[PDB]
Amino acid sequence: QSNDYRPSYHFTPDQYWMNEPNGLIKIGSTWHLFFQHNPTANVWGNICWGHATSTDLMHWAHKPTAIADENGVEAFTGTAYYDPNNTSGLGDSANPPYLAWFTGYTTSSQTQDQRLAFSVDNGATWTKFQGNPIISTSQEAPHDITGGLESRDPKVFFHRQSGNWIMVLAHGGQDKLSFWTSADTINWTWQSDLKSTSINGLSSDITGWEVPDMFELPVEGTEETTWVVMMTPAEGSPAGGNGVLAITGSFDGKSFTADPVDASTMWLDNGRDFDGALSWVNVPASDGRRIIAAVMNSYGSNPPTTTWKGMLSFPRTLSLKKVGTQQHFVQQPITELDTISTSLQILANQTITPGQTLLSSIRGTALDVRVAFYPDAGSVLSLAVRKGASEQTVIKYTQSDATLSVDRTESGDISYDPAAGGVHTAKLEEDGTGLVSIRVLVDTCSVEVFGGQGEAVISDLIFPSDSSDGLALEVTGGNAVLQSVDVRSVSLE
Ligand SMILES: OC[C@H]1O[C@](O)(CO)[C@@H](O)[C@@H]1O
Ligand SMILES: OC[C@H]1O[C@](O)(CO)[C@@H](O)[C@@H]1O
Ligand code: NA
């Protein structure tokens, strides 16, 4: 579109198609990113693990395929982990191995089995374990009523309290995860299933369970932690379709016991385009952040981009914290973003009234714009981004029903898919000072909108013309006092 809508500060594959991230892991001062890669760049192409690395979660260096599809077996999604005691015996004492478990998909028969790869050069190159699969369709069949066509996406981590490796497997339309234990990463034993029917407050509409992750989260600050399982069900999300949700509970090394869930707080995004989220494991304690990323493309091959398809979301932290008196999952872009952005316009304590249009001089397609404001009762604040002649993507805050909305009815090209337009909403309240906060990462073909402390998030693809690079900040039905507005441009350099 002049430039194939390439994002200028989000990850996209150097060429061809990406789906969800895989094997997210920090090794030394390097963040590793793998992802489902389709180099054939049509719907029938074989999937492998693509690979990129960075020191800052932003400047990515593309690497060759890490786990190839081979011998009729495609390398479907999975996760990674460090084996410092060489419990796998795949490394040695001098360098314990880094490990990746992935689903092997036999294209012709459609079977799904679990496989292992290992790296002894700190994640540079990966070798498939000679004993693969480590979990055969035979082992899966007593737990998979398709007999091993629906067992995938292994999340694996070492459980200190119990001294075992833990594998969490998803089962698609059987609407459950299974928990398996191992001492050596290779020989697994089923322990339990976590089934939709067992989770109080989880709707029947939430089906097609994929992409589990599992970790402990500090539960606010309060010296206590909790176990989190995060997954991407194929149905049931706020914007409809696939979506990312998270559930707290306890874990004893064999089975997960979920807390009651609340539909109003379980989903990690209310837009269309944030799906297959994983977190970076092995993050040193001095950092201590839970950082997640997902693919933004809910439209398969439809996005009007040619040399690439699929983009990674901008990495964001995930935390549990009280907003009012409700505990929420809360997300914010990583603070590293502040190192690559520059203010183009800053407002402090500025009153906006119906009829004015602020931010009219700004031109950019890569922006990170904060607004914090005290709206009048019954006022509607609107921030139009990627604005041109007949194009705009409008973020509104409606005070009267406390709703953050993202409206793509006029974004640009919304003809590529029936779900490309419309309006997405999320609940967002004033804080106790009356202050509403909103932050929008704008890039060539996306918006990621955070409300409040990050209790509300809407991530969506958009395809405006390149010349649609204005902003317009307006208010109707009332005034607002803009405590701050910081419009920053973003550049990788
Ligand atoms: O396993 C790779 C992931 O992509 C999917 O096709 C989701 O549609 C499944 O394969 C899995 O969730
Ligand atoms: O949307 C489906 C996604 O998966 C791919 O086949 C790559 O693995 C791409 O077409 C696309 O971005
Ligand atoms: Na989605």
UniProtKB/Swiss-Prot annotation:
It is found in: Secreted. Changing P39G: Impairs catalytic activity. Changing D275A: Decreases catalytic activity. Keywords: Carbohydrate metabolism, Glycoprotein, Glycosidase, Hydrolase, Polysaccharide degradation, Secreted, Signal. The keyword Lipid biosynthesis does not apply. It holds the Pfam family Glyco_hydro_32C. The keyword Chaperone does not apply. GO terms for biological process: polysaccharide catabolic process; sucrose catabolic process. Glycans are attached at N85, N86, N187, N349. GO terms for molecular function: inulinase activity; sucrose alpha-glucosidase activity. GO terms for cellular component: cytoplasm; extracellular region. It catalyses: Endohydrolysis of (2->1)-beta-D-fructosidic linkages in inulin. SUPFAM superfamilies: Arabinanase/levansucrase/invertase, Concanavalin A-like lectins/glucanases. Substrate binds at M18, N19, E20, N38, D153, N297. Belongs to the glycosyl hydrolase 32 family. Endo-inulinase involved in utilization of the plant storage polymer inulin, consisting of fructooligosaccharides with a degree of polymerization (DP) value from 2 to 60. This is Extracellular endo-inulinase inu2. The gene is inu2.
